[PDB]
Ligand binder design. Structure first.
Ligand SMILES: O=C(O)[C@H]1O[C@@H](O)[C@H](O)[C@@H](O)[C@@H]1O
Length: 466
């Protein structure tokens, strides 16, 4: 029989605001070698982005951002017209790649079709300062100041000391040396160039020092998060993914500290379920939908201003898989992001769970949407326990629920949201939407084990609204 838990919504306890550009994706800079991928002609991928959000952020970086070289004088045919660059697997140096001017032109078209903004990585790892300044000039001219959110100078510089990009003695001070040189060169050529950093892999000790040292130079602070890895490790499983861990706790403490101590916004600019390119039977499963949806809300509740889920090609953890030649499809993780998309922007509200020690992995977030309607996103990440949730503090004549479901937590397919799969080019409409009648602010919702739900509550006395 279900675990009976209480959910107390407190509309008077206002939390952080979820901005319209909260959602986002991350891709390898190596993708810029193929101008057909981020292109106005890539209507399928653009549709998947628009379904994820009217607004949102595309971040380009990753390990390959150290191995990609802008060449303003490249033959256009230097482009690899067939490349679908999956997440870097981090085992060794990536292939070097050239970025052509047409790739940047096509990226602008893609941003225009999607309505998304851009975070753009620059090659501080293996590139020169002059070439970074040239690259930044072209991107600023082509993408424009309205859509260019930030440049980032190097990806995960806290790992340079061990992956061969720098000597083993590389540390924060040395990175701050590197960063200052690149910054200055770029600003000389592009006086309005926006920046973010440090784009760190894990090392939260770099965050406040970076923010303090470069406070007047950056728009926001960024760091990364991967829940699990390596993939070959038998301890890295679906159940573990449903649980908090010390890394997440430190990253969360980390973002709170930098926001409190500096007043700069934080963005989680690269995240996914398992590093080294993800884990088959974990990252590509319905479990990842619950993981990602919940992470979006948990991060927002802690103060994050956005997220970028890493992906590309047919990578085990990619939200969207495919190529311009064969077409694109939503993987399971996409459906967690879709639940968030459907919930929309607004302001988080107090929502406390009780009597939940036998269902400890259930999470719930309450939101007053921009339109004034209360929503509740719930993730029953308990793999073995169904729950019955007694919801109080929501006064509405009624709510509807859209379910996030698959027949088993490890399914690589059969994933639906609101009773429907996502179709071609991001097409999605709910086909199953159940009612919940309520009284005195009280509602009772059952959820199967390993499932999600989005509740949307009706306005009071709004039946005859225009
Ligand atoms: O290992 C991974 O999956 C990812 O690790 C991150 O640290 C890198 O920035 C990215 O390029 C990789 O794809």
């Amino acid at each position: 029989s279900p675990v009976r838990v209480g959910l107390s919504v407190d509309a008077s306890a206002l939390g952080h605001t979820i901005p319209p550009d909260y959602t986002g994706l991350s891709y390898e800079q190596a993708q810029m070698a193929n101008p057909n991928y981020f292109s106005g002609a890539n209507t399928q991928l653009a549709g998947f982005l628009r379904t994820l959000g009217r607004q949102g952020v595309l971040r380009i970086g990753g390990n390959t951002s150290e191995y990609t070289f802008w060449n303003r004088h490249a033959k256009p045919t230097a482009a690899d017209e067939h490349l679908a660059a999956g997440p870097d697997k981090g085992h060794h140096a990536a292939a070097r790649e050239v970025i052509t001017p047409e790739a940047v032109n096509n990226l602008s078209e893609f941003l225009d079709k999607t309505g998304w903004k851009l975070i753009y990585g620059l090659n501080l790892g293996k590139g020169t300062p002059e070439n970074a300044a040239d690259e930044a000039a072209y991107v600023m001219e082509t993408i424009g100041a309205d859509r260019l959110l930030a440049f980032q100078l190097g990806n995960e510089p806290d790992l340079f000391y061990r992956n061969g990009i720098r000597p083993a003695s590389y540390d924060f001070a040395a990175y701050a040396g590197d960063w200052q040189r690149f910054f200055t060169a770029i600003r000389k050529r592009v006086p309005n160039a926006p920046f973010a950093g440090p784009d760190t892999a894990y090392n939260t000790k770099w965050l406040v020092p970076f923010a303090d040292k470069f406070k007047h130079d950056v728009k926001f602070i960024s760091s990364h998060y991967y829940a699990e890895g390596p993939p070959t490790d038998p301890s890295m499983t679906i159940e573990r993914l449903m649980k908090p861990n010390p890394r997440l706790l430190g990253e969360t403490a980390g973002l709170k500290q930098v926001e409190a101590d500096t007043g700069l916004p934080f963005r989680l600019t690269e995240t996914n379920s398992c590093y080294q390119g993800g884990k088959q039977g974990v990252s590509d499963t319905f479990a990842a939908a619950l993981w990602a949806g919940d992470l979006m809300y948990q991060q927002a509740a802690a103060g994050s201003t956005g997220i970028n889920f890493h992906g590309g090609g047919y990578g085990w953890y990619t939200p969207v898989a495919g190529t311009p030649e064969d077409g694109f499809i939503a993987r399971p993780e996409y459906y967690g992001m879709l639940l968030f998309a459907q919930a929309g922007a607004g302001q988080l509200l107090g929502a406390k769970l009780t009597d939940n020690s036998a269902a400890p992995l259930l999470t719930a977030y309450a939101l007053r949407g921009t339109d004034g309607r209360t929503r509740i996103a719930l993730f029953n990440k308990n793999l073995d326990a169904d729950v019955e949730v007694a919801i109080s503090g929501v006064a509405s004549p009624s709510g509807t629920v859209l379910r996030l479901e698959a027949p088993r937590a490890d399914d690589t397919t059969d994933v639906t949201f609101g009773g429907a799969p996502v179709g071609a080019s991001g097409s999605w409409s709910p086909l199953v939407q159940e009612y919940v009648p309520g009284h005195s602010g009280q509602f009772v919702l059952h959820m199967r084990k390993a499932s999600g739900a989005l509740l949307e509550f009706a306005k009071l006395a709004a039946a005859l609204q225009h």
